[PDB]
Amino acid sequence: NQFYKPGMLVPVFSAAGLLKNGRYQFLLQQIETLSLLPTEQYAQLYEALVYRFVEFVQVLPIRLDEPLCSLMNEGLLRGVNSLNHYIQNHPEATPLERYALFSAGLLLEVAHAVVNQKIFITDEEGNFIKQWNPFSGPLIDDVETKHYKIMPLSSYYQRNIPSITPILVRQLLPDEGFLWLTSDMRVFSDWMQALRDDGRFEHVLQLFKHKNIDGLFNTLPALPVNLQDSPATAHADAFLNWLKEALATNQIKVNTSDAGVHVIPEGVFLEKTGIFKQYIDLHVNVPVNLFTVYQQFGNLFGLTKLSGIDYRFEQLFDALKRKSKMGFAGLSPTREGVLIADPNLIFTRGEIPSATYLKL
Amino acid sequence: NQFYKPGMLVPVFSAAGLLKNGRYQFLLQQIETLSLLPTEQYAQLYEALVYRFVEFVQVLPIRLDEPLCSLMNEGLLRGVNSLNHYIQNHPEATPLERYALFSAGLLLEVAHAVVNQKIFITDEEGNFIKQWNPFSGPLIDDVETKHYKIMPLSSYYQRNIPSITPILVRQLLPDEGFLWLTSDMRVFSDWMQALRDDGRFEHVLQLFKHKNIDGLFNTLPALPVNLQDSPATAHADAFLNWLKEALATNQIKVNTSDAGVHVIPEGVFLEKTGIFKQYIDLHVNVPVNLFTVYQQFGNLFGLTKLSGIDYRFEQLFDALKRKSKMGFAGLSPTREGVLIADPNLIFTRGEIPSATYLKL
Numbered sequence: 185n186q187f188y189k190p191g192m193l194v195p196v197f198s199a200a201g202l203l204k205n206g207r208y209q210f211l212l213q214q215i216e217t218l219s220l221l222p223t224e225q226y227a228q229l230y231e232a233l234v235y236r237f238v239e240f241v242q243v244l245p246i247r248l249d250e251p252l253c254s255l256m257n258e259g260l261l262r263g264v265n266s267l268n269h270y271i272q273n274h275p276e277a278t279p280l281e282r283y284a285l286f287s288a289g290l291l292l293e294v295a296h297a298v299v300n301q302k303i304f305i306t307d308e309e310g311n312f313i314k315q316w317n318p319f320s321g322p323l324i325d326d327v328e329t330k331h332y333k334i335m336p337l338s339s340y341y342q343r344n345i346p347s348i349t350p351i352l353v354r355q356l357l358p359d360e361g362f363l364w365l366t367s368d369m370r371v372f373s374d375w376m377q378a379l380r381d382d383g384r385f386e387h388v389l390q391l392f393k394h395k396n397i398d399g400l401f402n403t404l405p406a407l408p409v410n411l412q413d414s415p416a417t418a419h420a421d422a423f424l425n426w427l428k429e430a431l432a433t434n435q436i437k438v439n440t441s442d443a444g445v446h447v448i449p450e451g452v453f454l455e456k457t458g459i460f461k462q463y464i465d466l467h468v469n470v471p472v473n474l475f476t477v478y479q480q481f482g483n484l485f486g487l488t489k490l491s492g493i494d495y496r497f498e499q500l501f502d503a504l505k506r507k508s509k510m511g512f513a514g515l516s517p518t519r520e521g522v523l524i525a526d527p528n529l530i531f532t533r534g535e536i537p538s539a540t541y542l543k544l
Numbered sequence: 545n546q547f548y549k550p551g552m553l554v555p556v557f558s559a560a561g562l563l564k565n566g567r568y569q570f571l572l573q574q575i576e577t578l579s580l581l582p583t584e585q586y587a588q589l590y591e592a593l594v595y596r597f598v599e600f601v602q603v604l605p606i607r608l609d610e611p612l613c614s615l616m617n618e619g620l621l622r623g624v625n626s627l628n629h630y631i632q633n634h635p636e637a638t639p640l641e642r643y644a645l646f647s648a649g650l651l652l653e654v655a656h657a658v659v660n661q662k663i664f665i666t667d668e669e670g671n672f673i674k675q676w677n678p679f680s681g682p683l684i685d686d687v688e689t690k691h692y693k694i695m696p697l698s699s700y701y702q703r704n705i706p707s708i709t710p711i712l713v714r715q716l717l718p719d720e721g722f723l724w725l726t727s728d729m730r731v732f733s734d735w736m737q738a739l740r741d742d743g744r745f746e747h748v749l750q751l752f753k754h755k756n757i758d759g760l761f762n763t764l765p766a767l768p769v770n771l772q773d774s775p776a777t778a779h780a781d782a783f784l785n786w787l788k789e790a791l792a793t794n795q796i797k798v799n800t801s802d803a804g805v806h807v808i809p810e811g812v813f814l815e816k817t818g819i820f821k822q823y824i825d826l827h828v829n830v831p832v833n834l835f836t837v838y839q840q841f842g843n844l845f846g847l848t849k850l851s852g853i854d855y856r857f858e859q860l861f862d863a864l865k866r867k868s869k870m871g872f873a874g875l876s877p878t879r880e881g882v883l884i885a886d887p888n889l890i891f892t893r894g895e896i897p898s899a900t901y902l903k904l
Contacts, residue, residue, distance in 0.1 A: 317723075317726055317727075319723075320723070320726075343737065344733050344737070347710045347736040347737075348710075348736070350708075350711050351710050351714055354714070362679070366677055366679045366680075368854075368886075369662075370886060370888075373700075373701060373703075373704050377703065377704070379707065380706070526728075526730060528729075
């Protein structure tokens with residue numbers, strides 16, 4: 185069992201690459217038999233669904249403290265084992281009911297690919313290229329996408345799971361599959377209810393969750409993932425991890441005159457000669473200058489890339505009069521730095537402070 | 545204010561036909577000004593959204609005891625009036641926020657087109673041609689669709705509103721519109737929360753619901769709808785209305801030997817020489833024979849049409865021994881009739897009885 189380490193690069197796999205182990209191919213063979221469908225239709229409906237699911241979730245974990253591959257493997261187990269158990273209780277289950285249950289068990293947690301993290305597509309060095317939009321398709325739609333970073337989000341977006349799930353299910357199901365589900369309104373209704381987690385399928389899905397299910401498959405392999413270093417961002421990764429902990433335990437002034445971090449309605453502002461310098465000056469034994477940490481932060485969030493629209497160089501605008509009375513200015517108002525549009529990538533373990541002095 | 549009468553035919557309109565009144569064209573002009581968008585983009589994003597919305601909901605009421613056109617008119621008012629009020633409180637609202645709020649207010653109740661009724665597409669006489677699948681597109685996708693019947697459903701499907709809404713919103717929004725919403729995760733999050741009814745937009749949407757909103761538009765016209773008679777089904781319509789009331793007040797044996805109505809897992813069975821004959825024999829002053837009422841029921845539910853897959857001629861299979869001891873049989877087991885796959889079109893005002901003797 186392998187876990188993601190903050191800041192490492194993950195390779196992208198094809199669904200063929202993720203499904204190559206004999207255990208996954210035996211599961212597909214067993215699903216075909218449970219499906220009651222001819223081979224052409226099993227391939228169209230079930231096989232295509234699995235491949236599109238795996239391509240989409242890749243090796244992402246169900247939650248960030250869970251093992252890699254857990255999203256795909258728990259999906260596949262829930263689907264095959266629920267379907268097997270249900271059939272054993274209801275031998276008359278129709279082909280449509282079977283597809284409905286399988287797809288519900290498979291896709292149950294698919295929204296975790298959206299809410300738990302943002303995915304930064306990078307080059308082999310870790311430089312940001314673009315941010316994955318899961319609603320436009322899987323990572324593999326772009327044949328040049330080879331590596332990505334997992335950027336954790338606060339728990340704030342978990343509230344949207346009930347809205348995201350139905351969208352992503354229709355996005356991932358073959359068109360003919362979704363059309364067939366809509367051809368019976370009672371099945372469709374119970375399928376949509378099943379997908380809502382927290383109807384005829386509620387009992388078996390519950391048994392699955394309490395590990396009380398009779399399974400065809402006990403376990404699925406977790407293939408080894410060669411996580412790689414991110415040399416072009418490493419100091420910026422250490423900076424970010426530090427900033428997250430220090431915000432999580434109120435170690436940093438935010439929104440005051442003194443502080444190098446400000447929350448405005450447009451996001452979280454990180455002032456260069458503020459929060460970055462503070463980090464340098466706190467850590468006297470780490471071998472990096474402000475220039476390099478700031479540049480690497482630029483590399484990490486795509487500050488030079490037009491695709492990185494959420495992360496940009498900004499300047500914000502009493503302060504001078506203060507330095508004249510309390511300092512030596514008596515002998516520019518603007519503050520210089522990086523704006524991150526979604527503070528949930530920075531405040532990942534407590535409340536986002538309210539917007540509160542400097543403006544654009 | 546016009547209300548739907550059970551069993552009448554509704555004409556189909558084009559969005560151009562539904563939006564022709566000056567008040568709707570003035571609302572669109574005002575929306576363009578509130579949008580902050582150039583004309584090309586307003587047309588792509590807002591105008592296309594409205595036209596696709598109206599085409600989809602046609603003159604359907606928000607609820608079956610509400611006026612015709614109420615779905616489209618409350619949508620349009622909620623959208624324009626919420627957007628106007630919000631802007632007046634937040635003059636800095638971005639173009640994306642404005643589109644988000646407008647689309648949320650517009651589409652809020654769009655799932656009512658799916659859950660409140662089934663729509664039977666008919667010919668000018670009222671003969672069933674096919675059943676509308678709202679997930680495949682609006683009625684006007686088929687250029688031959690000119691008339692339809694509204695077939696009320698029980699309240700059972702209201703539980704699915706939270707799942708149906710997000711699907712139908714993505715289905716109806718221009719692709720570029722949905723993509724733009726997904727480009728900011730905080731806006732997207734608050735938009736999805738707004739769409740969930742029962743975030744930055746919750747306050748204005750609430751004001752709308754409690755009629756505490758400052759509006760640009762007070763009212764929208766309800767165009768007159770020429771509802772038409774359904775001669776090829778009229779006796780079947782009276783039958784159905786009668787069957788619904790009698791089930792709603794336990795006036796009919798169901799699931800017993802004696803009764804002409806049975807609930808099996810596959811739906812509600814209506815026996816020809818049972819429930820149809822009972823109706824004839826209860827109503828000695830209505831001028832119709834069993835043959836005509838049964839045939840017209842066939843016309844109503846498409847029993848001769850392959851598109852009417854939910855409604856079919858069936859035969860189900862003690863009874864003979866009973867007639868030998870208690871009748872004159874001593875001097876076929878099968879029962880003949882119509883199976884309706886979704887009992888929520890028959891039991892529209894109480895619980896569906898449990899499946900309980902005869903089988904396929």
